[PDB]
Amino acid sequence: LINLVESGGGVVQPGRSLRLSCAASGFTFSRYGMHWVRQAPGKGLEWVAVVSSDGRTTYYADSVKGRFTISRDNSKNTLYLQMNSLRAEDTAVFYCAKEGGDNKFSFDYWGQGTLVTVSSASTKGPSVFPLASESTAALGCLVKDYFPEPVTVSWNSGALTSGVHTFPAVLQSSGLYSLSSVVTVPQTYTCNVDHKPSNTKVDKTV
C-alpha cells in the first residue's frame, strides 16, 4: 500500500551537484516526518537528514551540513535532497525513509535506494583478459578497468552456470573497477561481458 520510489542518483564529478527525489504514495505524506539515510559501499546504515511533516524543520548530519538541503512538496508528495559540493566520500546508496505510524522513532517504509557515485573517473568499457595433472581445473576472465558499475558476465551465452563464480567488483586505486569470473571443471569456454555505460560488448573465448 505505502510506497516510496527514488530517482536522481547518478555518477558525478567532485564539486558538482545532484538532486535526488523520493515520491510517496499510499499514505498522507504531509503528516509524516521524512528522512534520508545512506549506505556507503560495504558499510552500514548512516543517517543523513530529516524534514518535518510541515517542512518547517530540518536537521542534518554534520558531514553534510552546508552542502545538502532537504525539502519536500506536500502537494506532489515528494521528498528531495539537493546535494551540492559533492565529494568522493559521499558515494553511497541513498535511501529515503518514512517515520513509522505506530512508532515515529522507527522507519516503517524505505525507498528502494538510489546510487550516488562521486568520481572523476571516465566512462570506460572493460578489457577482458583470459585466466588460463589435477582432478579439477579452473579458468575464467579478468574484467579489468571499467567504470562505472555494473557489468554482467555469463558463460557460453548462459548455457554454462554450474561451478561458476563471478566475484563482486573492487574499486582499484585508479578509480576504475575490476572483477574476475571463474569456472571450475572436473568443451569451449567463452565469457560474455556486457557493460552498458560504454555500450561495450565482448565474448572472450578462454
Binding site: 516526518g33 536537521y59 566475484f167 582499484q172 572483477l179 571450475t184
Partner: protein, 212 residues
C-alpha cells in the same frame, strides 16, 4: 548516540534459534527498532518499540529489552532469514537516528577446504603495461581464510585486493579472489610467484605458485 551490536557474525543452521544483541552507550529514551537487510536491497522494518512486530513480519521474529540492552530473537531460522540485521534508535530532539553496525546471520555448515588456483597475468594484459596475478579460493567454509602473496619470497603487502562471493545458495560455501597488482616492469624482474592459503579445512597451508 552509539549502538553496539554483537556478535559481528552469527553462524547458525536452519531451524536453530538466533539471538542478536544491541547495546546503547547510554539509556535510550525510546525503545529500539530492528531492520533486516539483504544484499542490494532496502532495509525492512522488523521490530519497533523494542518488542512490536511491523506489518507482515512473521511470528518467529521477536524483540525485547529496555534501557541500554536490547535483543532480537528468531525462534527458528528459515533459509530466507540469513541476512544482515541492524538496530536503530532515535529521539525527538535532536532528531538524528543512530544505527548499530549490523550483525550478519550466516549459515553454518561442515568445514570445507578451498581448492586453490593461481593465474599468471596474460600475455594479452602484459601487452598493455600491467600485470595482475590472481589467486582463487574455491568453495570453502568457514569464511575465515588467510591469503599471503610472495614474490621471490618477499611477502607482498598493500598491493593486493580481494573479493568474496555471497554464501552459495546450494552448498553454503564461500569463494574468494585475490588479485596482486604489479607494474609490468616489476613483474619481469622476479621469478617465483606464490599464493599461500591458510584455512581451517587445510591441515597444512596450501601454496600454489609458478615461475614466470
Amino acid at each position: 548516540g552509539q549502538l553496539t551490536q554483537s556478535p559481528a557474525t552469527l553462524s547458525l543452521s536452519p531451524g536453530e534459534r538466533a539471538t542478536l544483541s544491541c547495546r546503547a552507550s547510554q539509556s535510550v529514551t525510546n525503545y529500539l527498532a530492528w531492520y533486516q537487510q539483504k544484499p542490494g536491497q532496502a532495509p525492512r522494518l522488523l521490530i519497533y518499540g523494542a518488542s512490536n512486530r511491523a506489518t507482515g513480519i512473521p511470528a518467529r521474529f521477536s524483540g525485547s529489552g529496555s534501557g541500554t540492552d536490547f535483543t532480537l530473537t528468531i525462534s527458528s531460522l528459515e533459509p530466507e532469514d540469513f541476512a544482515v540485521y541492524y538496530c536503530q534508535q532515535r529521539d525527538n530532539w535532536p532528531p538524528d537516528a543512530t544505527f548499530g553496525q549490523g550483525t550478519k546471520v550466516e549459515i553454518k555448515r561442515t568445514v570445507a577446504a578451498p581448492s586453490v588456483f593461481i593465474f599468471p597475468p596474460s600475455d594479452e594484459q602484459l601487452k598493455s603495461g600491467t600485470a595482475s596475478v590472481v589467486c582463487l579460493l574455491n568453495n570453502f567454509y568457514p569464511r575465515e581464510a588467510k591469503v599471503q602473496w610472495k614474490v621471490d619470497n618477499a611477502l607482498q603487502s598493500g598491493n593486493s585486493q580481494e573479493s568474496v562471493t555471497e554464501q552459495d545458495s546450494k552448498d553454503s560455501t564461500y569463494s574468494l579472489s585475490s588479485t596482486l597488482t604489479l607494474s609490468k616492469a616489476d613483474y619481469e624482474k622476479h621469478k617465483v610467484y606464490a599464493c599461500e592459503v591458510t584455512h581451517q579445512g587445510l591441515r597444512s597451508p596450501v601454496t600454489k605458485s609458478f615461475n614466470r
